[PDB]
Amino acid sequence: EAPHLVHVDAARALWPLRRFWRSTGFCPPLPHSQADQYVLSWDQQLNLAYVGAVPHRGIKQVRTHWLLELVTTRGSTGRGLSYNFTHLDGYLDLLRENQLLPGFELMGSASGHFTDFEDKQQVFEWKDLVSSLARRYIGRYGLAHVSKWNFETWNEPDHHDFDNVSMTMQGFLNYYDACSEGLRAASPALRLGGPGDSFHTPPRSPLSWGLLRHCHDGTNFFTGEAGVRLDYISLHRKGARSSISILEQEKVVAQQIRQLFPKFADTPIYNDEADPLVGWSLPQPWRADVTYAAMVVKVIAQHQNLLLANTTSAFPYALLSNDNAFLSYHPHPFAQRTLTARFQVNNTRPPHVQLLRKPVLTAMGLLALLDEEQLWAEVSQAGTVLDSNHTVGVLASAHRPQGPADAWRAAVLIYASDDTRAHPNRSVAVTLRLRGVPPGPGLVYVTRYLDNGLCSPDGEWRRLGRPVFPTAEQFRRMRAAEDPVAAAPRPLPAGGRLTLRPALRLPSLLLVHVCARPEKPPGQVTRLRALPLTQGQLVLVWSDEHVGSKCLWTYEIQFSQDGKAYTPVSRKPSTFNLFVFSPDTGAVSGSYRVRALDYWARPGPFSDPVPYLEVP
Ligand SMILES: *[C@@H]1O[C@H](CO)[C@@H](O[C@@H]2O[C@H](CO)[C@@H](O[C@@H]3O[C@H](CO[C@H]4O[C@H](CO[C@H]5O[C@H](CO)[C@@H](O)[C@H](O)[C@@H]5O[C@H]5O[C@H](CO)[C@@H](O)[C@H](O)[C@@H]5O)[C@@H](O)[C@H](O[C@H]5O[C@H](CO)[C@@H](O)[C@H](O)[C@@H]5O[C@H]5O[C@H](CO)[C@@H](O)[C@H](O)[C@@H]5O)[C@@H]4O)[C@@H](O)[C@H](O[C@H]4O[C@H](CO)[C@@H](O)[C@H](O)[C@@H]4O[C@H]4O[C@H](CO)[C@@H](O)[C@H](O)[C@@H]4O)[C@@H]3O)[C@H](O)[C@H]2NC(C)=O)[C@H](O)[C@H]1NC(C)=O
Ligand SMILES: *[C@@H]1O[C@H](CO)[C@@H](O[C@@H]2O[C@H](CO)[C@@H](O)[C@H](O)[C@H]2NC(C)=O)[C@H](O)[C@H]1NC(C)=O
Ligand SMILES: *[C@@H]1O[C@H](CO)[C@@H](O)[C@H](O)[C@H]1NC(C)=O
Ligand SMILES: [Cl-]
Q1: Which positions are annotated as binding alpha-L-iduronate?
Q2: Into how many domains does the chain fold?
Q3: Which ligand 3 atom minimizes the distance to the CA of 84?
Q4: Which of 86, 89, 91, 111 to mutate to test the pocket of ligand 3 (most atoms within 8 A of CB)?
Q5: Which of 347, 351, 364 is nearest to 413 (CA)?
Q6: CA 420 to CA 289: how far, in whole Å?
């Protein structure tokens, strides 16, 4: 078989490249009124630390169901009604602590107070609850912050998961007007969209189409004004194992909306559950490893190249979210649709929890390296040009430099993916010809590579015999496979051109990073935290907000016990903003500090030191 040729032209920055995929989401389990226990548990604290640690704000939003089950009430409609926001504060603070935003679905019953969206008193109360919420979080976080949040309707109104709430077609419309007026009363600057459903062919999905008809033509329950604002339209379409099918289904719904509701011609569209396959909890081997990670990249490449890049349609697609922040269950720690693999290690005194970063999470780190301009690229095989609707594709970006702490970069991400199918004995020959690299000081390139043989913690877990309660040693062995294989910085050839011939597996991901040397070294690591795991172990997590350049080789972690000299912690190169520290001696009490190391072996300054004393 002829090699796949991938040509990238760094002299042709074509149009902006938006990072429209920086979202995840989850649903707490039953009973929903106990969402607080799932959402504020140590598991979730760890889980969100991992979501937030993807570098360069690679994941921004966490679309969370049943947020309003986190609010309780005192009194009643008649004698005076009060809200207790404590558990909601807890969860929202937890997101903020990890630099994440909620996908704020206005979903739940405030501990069973709201039962009927056609009851006029209830609709008026809802409006005030929504204003109270917004005003509260505007005061707690600032208007600039909260006005970044995608407030959204109840999830999947056409799927009837309303617990004991009666939400008719009319009810849903009243509920919507209360949301819209509730938020508007707090501030006209806040964003609301919906309905978050399939938009199946009419007469199906009637609440969804209903909502659009209501906002476009109906009358506001409170003001009586014609038309109600709708800032974005969110749909769900999953691929039933096909990547390109997600896009095909989207184009069909977008077309129907464009024709039926002209006022909505420019209204941004979200697919905020854009998963390969419906049913997060169904174990699938491909969800465990690079198969799913490469498919996630493939789906994003298809959106960028076949939808956003230009088109006849040029339809206003703004967000894609893989709904994958759920926590996994025994006996399927790795094979559920989750960013992390959860191990409830019950045999320690006391029981504890460990998470492993799955390849899909790691791949979000690769997408995070993409910069703000798209470069011209073209994939071909035997002289035939292949668009991203094929097993091999590419996404290539460039960065226009600003300060002395910055310089030109190109990021080239290549995927080899047959959707949900792995091909363990296939090898795909690729010839990458990058040309038109502008001249610049100290031009180097670094490669990062993911496949199932080298970077699958699931694979390592199976090689160890799938231990249900892995040992500390066995966890170390599993984690050694979390990061891509990194190759040390190499100078670019003379002349402006780079050509590589990597052999890709199916699936695999390859990121080729080309950087010119910024004048100044990296910035400081901030917000370092040390969180207990169990006797002998902790997780370090930090922020890269002030680090500056994306041309990072690793973070150097240093440890000092007894005021004694700081000593580097030996480990794989990694740009992930979190590390599980589990030394063989078990010695973890002391101080820690972390700094960025760039592609030219320059350090940024150390974080403030962080004391840690193990409670015995
Ligand atoms: C170390 O210690 C750990 C504790 O610290 C131990 O941890 C425990 O491990 C167990 C695994 O061994 C876990 O048990 C398993 O739990 C899961 C999840 O349970 C929860 O979620 C369920 C699903 O909720 C979704 O769906 C509903 C709608 O149906 C929604 O309302 C939810 O919002 C949610 O929706 C999202 O997700 C779905 C996908 O599921 C999406 O489709 C949606 O769109 C959303 O995104 C939920 O149903 C469960 O609710 C039950 O339990 C509640 C109390 O916890 C209770 O209040 C509820 O009424 C309900 O109770 C009934 O059922 C349970 C049994 O589940 C009974 O005990 C109880 O008496 C009631 O009858 C819950 O909220 C769960 O799915 C698993 O169940 C499957 O497998 C077992 C067999 O193992 C069967 O019992 C089940 O019927 C079910 O069947 C599977 O297989 C069937 C055929 O085989 C087939 O029908 C399916 O294929 C199906 O998969 C397990 O029960 C336990 O959760 C976990 N504990 C904790 C705290 O984490 C750990 O085990 C230990 N380690 C070791 C090694 O010992
Ligand atoms: C992506 O490629 C697939 C695979 O070739 C295309 O699927 C075919 O589309 C044609 C219409 O031009 C149908 O006649 C075939 O039935 C489809 N494939 C089957 C059955 O495997 C698909 O059209 C392409 N999609 C996009 C958006 O380019
Ligand atoms: C709000 O609820 C929490 C959690 O149950 C509780 O600890 C707190 O005291 C409550 N506040 C009031 C005023 O009741
Ligand atoms: Cl999936």
Answers
A1: 65, 155-156, 238, 273, 279, 323, 337
A2: 3
A3: 1
A4: 86
A5: 364
A6: 11
